[PDB]
């Protein structure tokens, strides 16, 4: 942003109308644009002035009838009265010109064509007037759009500034939702801008529609109401279809959310699914959900494709009905009237296509005003401003009675508190005694009923949650204060921030998120102190600053700072630890809001009150490859050819109906002699044609065929795009579910989950719609060009230059338009971050009285975000104006070609050409608009296809070595021979030359340090990752010769963390349903789970949600071993099945495990040496090596044994607390 004066304020009517300044800016840009090249916001569009005017208007409106019936709609209307009135007048002029020009000019031109005499001057005046009227209406529309954009930008800025100002002084911060508050100051502005723009554009339909209806009634006669009746019977049907599509999308949203939740659940425990060979059940469930979503999308597309393209269909149907009824009754019809009616119907269709978005914008505006009025009535916070009697006393309250606000909730009664400067006063009490009430009252969040409160100076506030600012260590600590070296060093040393600086390589400039992603509770508390220290206020308020901090560091910080730096300033201490008040100056005890005992520490101890009791208690651009891939996935070139053929068939049927109407008009009497009086002669009248019924039947059949073909084409296109989407879904699901988990380890599941969700929702919502719209617009434009060129072969000599000019305009425009959109979102991220940070820390800003700098920053960000948006809208309007001018030139060329050849062609062909030339308006702009949004989805298609050909292939399901034996394993004997294991390439080896033998029916407990390789035994035993060396023999058969499906079918592993898939209890035990009821009941009663299951009325049909947070933890674990029992595997491995659980529950679990699998081998991967006692043998791993291999009886009898040393260390750690 670097400019002196905005070019808009220094532009004339023609310059602003044609947007010459932005054209010059684009020509300057034409390879990229930065923020240093764009202009800043204009002075007239500044947020400060608009916000002040809006606030003044709101204040004036409030003091009119009272703050109970004031509507912000009246305030908005008053604010934008002049601009909206000017916009309405300009749109009236535009609609009047657009109704007077084409219809009258076409009627005059076709009437002159039928005349026998030819004039080379009268037609030139008509075409010149038509061109002038079209230019005038286009320029007026451009001016209206520019004024509406300016008004909307100003209104959005003013309303956002007012909303931010009101929020900064909110009393009940937690009353409103966190998301709603952000959405109010982020999304509502765009809604208001769009609503104002399209509401100013609204007054273009009801006027021109009535004018056209009156013109048709005057021209045709009593039969002119047929088109009106057709429109009234058709457009509400389209509205009902749109409502039905929205209703179907409502359930589609829930279906997509369910599919997303299922995919997230599958990806969260992908390791467990692979280790349990339960892929098929989840795949079938996902397929069923996908087919349900496919049916919902099929219904939505069937109910949506009807309204995609309906204006030409409505025009043709209305023309068919009107002309058939008028001509069949015996009246007379001419080409001029018919084509004038066709053009007027086109005008009504354009108006009634523009109108629905205006209605939607009006509804959105009403919703936005209601929401804003809901927030603007919230209570405001107040600040204490009265001064004490003497400067010596800083805090003074006399029998003050204060109550909470939500109604008044009294909590403090008869409060007599007096604190002098330099005195440290502490607050003691329990939860709900009123310790937090006093903190809230001293800030100013409580109302006063009796007495008075004296407050002098400001306060330094520290939050319990330690709210942080979206900045670095240097910025947030200063908090806008001046930077000095010695003070900063002393503050850093006082709070012991040196370890924090040493840990972070760039702690001086380390960025911190809204809440803190790389910080702990103690570090956040310490930073809070540092910031508060720098603030250096007269009064210090500490609301539990050493709660999460450790005792030693907290005491050190207290002694170094509070007992030294704050010896001459008032300090208020509120904490749950009463041991810090021994050296404090004064002690105050809070109990039920009433003061009972207060004074010094020794006096409090001598009084033997409740304080003594509690004290002694605590003491103890995409390439064509993406398009080709999409075409191939759609069903090959055959589907594309079929779709194109159906679209061309529909468009050609419409064009053939129009051409047959023109042919019928041109036919006339067909050289038939009729009697009109005393003499007989040929009369040119269409009512004398004896083939009336033939033409009428052909016309009706053509209309019906066009409708049927349109419906068939829509259905086929929807089916094809949904089949392509389903094919892509199945292919992507198969690729991910079969790829090795190394991809999951390298790339987090969040990335693929977000890709799935966003890409699939976006494609299934937009891509068929945009593709259908673009194809229809392109084919309609091509047919319109061809039909005009068909009648006049010389039409191409002007199309060519116009074609290259349009291509040049598109080339230049495609760079600037796509660049300004990126710059709009560049500053949006700081805007949203600043909005989020302010709301999360409103209390801290209110306490620090920093509501002005934040407001100024918000205004600056709002201006820096509004300027690129305004520039982008102006560029869009300039492109639309250029396209409209191109279409105007095309229409002028068509009319000029029509004029020169008058008398050589039938008037019907000229009328057809002039009618098809008029429809070309808007089509070019629509084609250009849809050529940029379709590509935005093809990049998502390319991103989806990227993982399709990138994922590798895991081991085959069936190994050519075949199954070893039908009863394998024959026993439970395992052997190791130089086991080599590594997680990834270039990583250090986990297992290096480890060999051991495990006898049948042995209990093995593996215990070792972190990183030794204890967790790697399970990965290598299951052939999760191919070994880099050595061989493993089980029952005399090498493991590597057995397929993955067969190997995992006879081995059991207990997960470290209980896992419960969403669904049914039976589905969580055996989804494939291979076991019988009696076996399941016996397994349940083995772990004493029969009582907890049969009690529910849905024992086998109980609903289990995510993570199974409906039973107890012990119940979940017991269900886990019960599930592990079903597979009946001779080899079992246990890995840390206990985590922060009661004692008797673990005892019961251990005894159940011991009794249930007494005949199965044990490989216990546990870190607790107490639980591994009594096992047959103990395994110790030392950085991937084995040193001790014997029974624990002789291991504990040797002092030099490492296992004995570890057991002694564990015993010492348990015994010493201390």
């Amino acid at each position: 942003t670097s400019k002196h004066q905005h070019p808009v304020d220094n532009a004339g009517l023609f310059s602003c109308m044609t947007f010459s300044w932005l054209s010059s800016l684009a020509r300057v840009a034409h390879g990229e644009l930065s923020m240093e090249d764009v202009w800043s916001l204009s002075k007239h569009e500044s947020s400060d002035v608009n916000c002040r005017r809006l606030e003044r208007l709101w204040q004036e409106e409030l003091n009119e009838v009272g703050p109970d019936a004031a509507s912000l709609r009246r305030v908005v209307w008053i604010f934008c009265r002049t601009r909206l009135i000017l916009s309405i007048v300009c749109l009236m002029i535009t609609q009047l010109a657009g109704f007077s020009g084409p219809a009258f000019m076409v009627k005059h031109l076709l009437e002159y064509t039928q005349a026998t005499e030819s004039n080379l001057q009268y037609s030139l005046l008509l075409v010149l007037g038509l061109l002038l009227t079209e230019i005038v209406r286009s320029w007026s529309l451009a001016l209206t759009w520019a004024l509406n954009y300016r008004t909307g930008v100003r209104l959005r800025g003013a309303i956002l500034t007012m909303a931010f100002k009101k929020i900064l002084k909110l009393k009940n911060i937690k009353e409103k939702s966190l998301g709603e508050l952000i959405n109010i100051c982020s999304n509502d502005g765009q809604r208001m801008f769009e609503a104002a723009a399209v509401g100013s554009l609204l007054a273009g339909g009801p006027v021109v529609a009535i004018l056209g209806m009156i013109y048709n009634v005057i021209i045709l006669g009593p039969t002119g109401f047929l088109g009106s009746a057709v429109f009234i019977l058709f457009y509400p049907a389209m509205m009902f279809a749109s409502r039905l599509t929205a209703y179907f999308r409502r359930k589609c949203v829930a279906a997509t959310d369910e599919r997303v939740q299922k995919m997230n659940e599958v990806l969260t425990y992908i390791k467990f699914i692979k280790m349990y060979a339960w892929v098929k059940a989840f795949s079938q469930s996902v397929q069923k959900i996908r087919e349900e979503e496919r049916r919902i999308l099929e219904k939505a597309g069937y109910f949506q494709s009807i309204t995609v393209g309906v204006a030409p269909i409505v025009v043709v149907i209305a023309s068919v009905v009107t002309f058939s009824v008028h001509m069949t009754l015996g009246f007379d019809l001419t080409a001029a009237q018919a084509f004038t009616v066709v053009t007027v119907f086109n005008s009504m269709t354009f108006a009634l296509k523009v109108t629905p978005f205006s209605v939607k914008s009006l509804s959105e505006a009403s919703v936005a005003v209601d929401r804003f009025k809901s927030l603007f009535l919230m209570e405001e916070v107040h600040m204490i401003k009265n001064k004490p009697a003497s400067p010596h006393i800083k805090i003074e309250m006399k029998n003050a009675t204060l109550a909470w606000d939500s109604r008044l909730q009294r909590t403090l009664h008869s409060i007599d508190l007096e604190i002098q400067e330099g005195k440290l006063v502490g607050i003691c009490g329990s939860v709900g005694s009123g310790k937090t009430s006093l903190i809230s009252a001293i800030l100013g969040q409580m109302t006063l009923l009796e007495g008075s409160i004296a407050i002098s100076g400001t306060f330094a506030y520290v939050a319990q949650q330690a709210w942080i600012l979206n900045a670095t260590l240097r910025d947030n600590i200063l908090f806008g204060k001046e930077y000095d070296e010695e003070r900063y060093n002393s503050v850093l040393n006082s709070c012991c921030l040196r370890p924090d600086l040493a840990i972070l390589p760039s702690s001086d400039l380390t960025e911190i998120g809204e809440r803190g992603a790389n910080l702990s509770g103690g570090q956040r508390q310490r930073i809070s102190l540092a910031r508060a220290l720098y603030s250096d206020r007269s009064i210090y308020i500490l609301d539990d600053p050493l709660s999460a901090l450790d005792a030693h560091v907290g005491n050190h910080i207290f002694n170094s700072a509070i007992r030294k730096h704050l010896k001459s300033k008032t300090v208020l201490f509120v904490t749950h630890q009463l041991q810090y008040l021994v050296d404090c100056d004064e002690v105050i005890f809070m109990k039920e809001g009433c003061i009972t005992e207060r004074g010094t520490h020794e006096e409090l101890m001598n009084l033997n009150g409740d304080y003594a009791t509690i004290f002694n208690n605590l003491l103890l651009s995409v390439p064509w490859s993406v398009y080709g891939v999409y075409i191939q996935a759609a069903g090959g070139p055959l589907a594309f050819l079929v779709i194109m053929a159906l679209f061309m068939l529909n468009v050609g049927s419409t064009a053939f109906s129009t051409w047959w109407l023109s042919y019928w008009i041109k036919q006339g009497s067909g050289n038939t002699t009729v009697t009109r009086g005393n003499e007989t002669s040929v009369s040119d009248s269409m009512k004398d044609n004896p083939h009336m019924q033939y033409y009428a039947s052909i016309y009706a059949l053509s209309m019906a065929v066009m409708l049927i073909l349109k419906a068939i084409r829509g259905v086929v296109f929807v089916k094809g795009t949904l089949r392509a989407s389903s094919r892509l879904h199945d292919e992507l699901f198969r690729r991910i579910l079969r790829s090795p988990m190394k991809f999951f380890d390298t790339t987090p599941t969040g990335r693929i989950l977000n890709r799935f969700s966003k890409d699939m929702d976006e494609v299934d919502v937009r891509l068929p719609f945009q593709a259908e719209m673009f194809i229809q617009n392109v084919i309609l434009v091509f047919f319109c060009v061809g039909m005009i060129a068909g009648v006049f072969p010389w039409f191409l000599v002007a199309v060519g230059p116009l074609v290259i000019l349009f291509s040049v305009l598109h080339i230049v425009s495609r760079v600037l338009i796509r660049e300004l959109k990126r710059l709009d979102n560049i500053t949006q991220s700081p805007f949203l971050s600043h909005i989020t940070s302010s709301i999360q820390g409103l209390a801290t800003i209110h306490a620090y009285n920093k509501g002005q700098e934040f407001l100024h920053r918000y205004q600056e960000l709002l201006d820096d975000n509004q300027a690129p948006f305004f520039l982008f809208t102006c560029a869009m309007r300039w492109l639309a104006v250029r396209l409209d001018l191109i279409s105007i030139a095309l229409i002028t060329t068509t009319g000029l070609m029509i004029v020169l050849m008058h008398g050589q062609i039938p008037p019907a062909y000229a009328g057809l050409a002039i009618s098809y030339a008029v429809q070309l308006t808007g089509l070019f702009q629509f084609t250009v608009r849809l050529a940029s949004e379709t590509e935005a989805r093809f990049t998502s298609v390319e991103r989806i296809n990227h993982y399709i050909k990138t994922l590798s292939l895991e081991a085959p399901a069936r190994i050519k070595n075949k199954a070893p034996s039908p009863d394998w394993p024959q026993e439970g004997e395992v052997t190791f021979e130089n086991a080599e294991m590594r997680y990834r390439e270039n990583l250090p080896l986990v297992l290096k030359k480890v060999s051991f033998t495990i006898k049948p029916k042995e209990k093995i407990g593996i215990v070792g340090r972190t990183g030794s390789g204890k967790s790697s035994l399970g990965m290598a035993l299951f052939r999760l990752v191919e070994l880099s060396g050595g061989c493993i023999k089980i029952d005399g058969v090498r493991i590597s010769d057995i397929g993955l499906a067969d190997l995992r079918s006879k081995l059991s592993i207990i997960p470290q963390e209980p896992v419960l898939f969403s669904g049914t209890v039976r589905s969580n035990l055996d989804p494939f349903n291979q076991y019988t009821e009696d076996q399941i009941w016996d397994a349940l009663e083995r772990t004493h789970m029969k009582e907890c299951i049969a009690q529910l009325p849905l024992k086998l049909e109980s609903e289990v949600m995510e993570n199974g947070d409906n039973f107890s933890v012990g119940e979940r674990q017991l269900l886990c071993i019960a599930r592990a029992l079903l597979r009946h595997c001779k080899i079992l491995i246990l890995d840390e099945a206990t985590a922060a659980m009661d004692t008797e529950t673990d005892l019961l679990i251990q005894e159940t495990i011991r009794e249930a699998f007494a005949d199965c081998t044990m490989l216990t991967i546990a870190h607790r040496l107490h639980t591994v006692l009594g096992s047959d043998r103990i395994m110790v791993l030392a950085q991937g090596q084995v040193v001790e291999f014997d029974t624990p009886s002789v291991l504990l009898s040797n002092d030099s044994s490492r296992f004995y040393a570890m057991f002694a260390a564990a015993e010492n750690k348990v015994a010493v607390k201390g």
Binding site: V198, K353, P356, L832, F926
Partner: peptide
């Protein structure tokens, strides 16, 4: 919400994006 009767009229210079604001 996004039917042809709405997006076609806003294709005259209005962005085809309502909110896209939901966050974590």
């Amino acid at each position: 919400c996004q039917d042809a009767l709405e997006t076609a009229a806003r294709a005259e210079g209005l962005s085809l994006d309502a909110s896209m604001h939901s966050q974590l």
